[PDB]
Ligand binder design. Sequence first.
Ligand SMILES: CC(=O)c1sc(Nc2ccccc2)nc1C
Lengths: 404, 404
Amino acid sequence: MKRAVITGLGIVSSIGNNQQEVLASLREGRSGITFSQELKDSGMRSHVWGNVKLDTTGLIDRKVVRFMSDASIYAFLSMEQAIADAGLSPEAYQNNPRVGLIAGSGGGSPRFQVFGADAMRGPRGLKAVGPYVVTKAMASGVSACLATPFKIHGVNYSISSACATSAHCIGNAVEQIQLGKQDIVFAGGGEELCWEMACEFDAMGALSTKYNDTPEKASRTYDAHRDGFVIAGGGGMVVVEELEHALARGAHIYAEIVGYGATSDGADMVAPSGEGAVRCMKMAMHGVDTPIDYLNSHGTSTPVGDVKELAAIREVFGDKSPAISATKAMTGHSLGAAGVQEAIYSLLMLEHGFIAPSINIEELDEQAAGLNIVTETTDRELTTVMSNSFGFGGTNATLVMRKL
Amino acid sequence: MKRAVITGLGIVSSIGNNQQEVLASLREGRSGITFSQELKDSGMRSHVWGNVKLDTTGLIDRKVVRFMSDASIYAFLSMEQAIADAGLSPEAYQNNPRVGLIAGSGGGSPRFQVFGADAMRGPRGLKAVGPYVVTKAMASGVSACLATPFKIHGVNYSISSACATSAHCIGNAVEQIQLGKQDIVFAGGGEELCWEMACEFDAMGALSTKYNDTPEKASRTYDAHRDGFVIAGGGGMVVVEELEHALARGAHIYAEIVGYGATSDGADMVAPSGEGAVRCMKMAMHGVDTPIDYLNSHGTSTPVGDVKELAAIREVFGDKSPAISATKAMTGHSLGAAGVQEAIYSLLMLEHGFIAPSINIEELDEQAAGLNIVTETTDRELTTVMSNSFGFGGTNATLVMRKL
Ligand SMILES: CC(=O)c1sc(Nc2ccccc2)nc1C
């Protein structure tokens, strides 16, 4: 069947506003986490976040940006980067029924939803709301706001699956190539960063609260004293392309997507089962005839979640587990953007031949013993990498990417 | 290639709480639209809606429903109906890696996004927010809140695409069957009905405002004096199943999904382009060796949209129009739920041999000549039916369903 490769990438993240900045942060083990006065002022217990450090004012034409929330702004800038990186001209990708876009967010825009309700409840009613809230607040905002300006004619929709959102977007893009329906699908996602959404996670006890005075130490996957994830925002986009089409245009190919797992736990709303993760990893590895050299774990810095995933990894890999690191210890958890951003970090590791460190492990959890959790940047010629995304609601995605 | 059939359906709609009530409404041309004191009290200009007329108290177990917003409640009730209609025991669909769920909403839960923000700003802060808002508010709430209690082990995610949401969910379910990855996928969606979301549509001028004193006449697709859509809520679910699997278990089969189009306009953000719809319909018709007997139009009762779709229909079919009716004149526009609900109305027409009327056309639009818009219930043996969903943001889905 038809093979899918990644031929371009773009990213706006807590650890860099393009792939050059991201690569430098990954190699340096640099945290993207900062103290947030906004989260503190809202009354939250978690006062830290992985913010995008970019003035986005003016970067997008007004006729386009007027429809957008921050998730769409970050995804749009990532898409522009990905198109440039792929070397795609408008003649090639615009008004082309074989070019699609599958990109989502986990939350839509709580900020604009709340803005609309607050405005409506004041004396000016509909006049205060204005005419742009639907495209900002709707769950499909990220795909809708990008498909128009980029003149996409093929598929156009958003997948959402909480932390797995943009990993399922990439896997669905692979499926469109496999079905022969598309030659290129831009795949990815975006997530805004705001107290309106963050407080929902803090209310469920999911966020880190004990390290507000030392923000760079709060996200600490696998450390014995981890206490929840650090919320983040941003976007990412990859160009998923059919192999013969890529070769025919002289594309730069980062990797082939040689496996895509998607499963469901059917168990707990907010905690992973393990069993679903084992099936998801095995599905992504089926038929893949090379070992996993590096695994970018879901690893959010939660007491239960981090070790549930490690137990699943031990079950999948038996006595030959891969090198592992949790890049969320540097970046935080960007929710709908995490799958694509972590696919990109993994592709940069593959392209540049290094493993990024799993930072802030002052005392390794007892349940991580015996695994090669890499804690210092390591040069290594990688061939095959895996990235896990295990979302709330028991939804799992795994991607396996390999050099061609 | 593996073939996909529909073996069960379930629905909670403005025109009925199960398929018996929906069938009777469709045959009678009975409006589901009522006056809404909630919309009026909120300051809106549109005071009409297609509400679900059902007391849902106690229909879902407390430990299940505590995670859910109304979109999930309606989708869950629809799924229970679909499972019973498909004759699936718990042992047949639970804990089964070959059984999946793809179901979404257009808006998630504006009500619970606003609830979380309002609670956080009050005297109890995080304690008033409570631990259930993420599962209510997140874009994937509908899939997350159903996949756990129904013990789904296969695919699990949401697609969102505004009006096309649950039609793309059904098409993607068909793709899982075609790829050989699933034997059954429950596909559908839900949408809450609330001023928090409705006011955003009224603020952009999208909703009907001139007919509040006569709610049943507000939604009037193709009428010269239409003035916007009437917002609605509800849910729907279909059981998409691989053909040989269905036959081997003695399933009742409504129809095969013989075509699925998904395209993008890539054009004016706020209006349908017409051309994307043409491409979508032709994609869904490709290889289908029988004529389209009946078309359930997207037709939302908007000035621009209704006649753009008619022009696309003329381009596709020339002088050989199928019979057409816009069931939204009865039901209103249930946004994320519209694709699956309209697929279900189309399946009921196919199963029971009639065309539902396009109601409230007192003066046919000057631009609607030369087609077969059916305005009176008409008994007729149908074989192949089409349903269009042309979503805000230029995202299109079309489904073609045919008797076996
Ligand atoms: C003017 C129109 O016809 C429409 S249809 C529509 N649909 C949805 C559905 C679900 C989420 C967002 C938008 N929005 C508008 C403004």
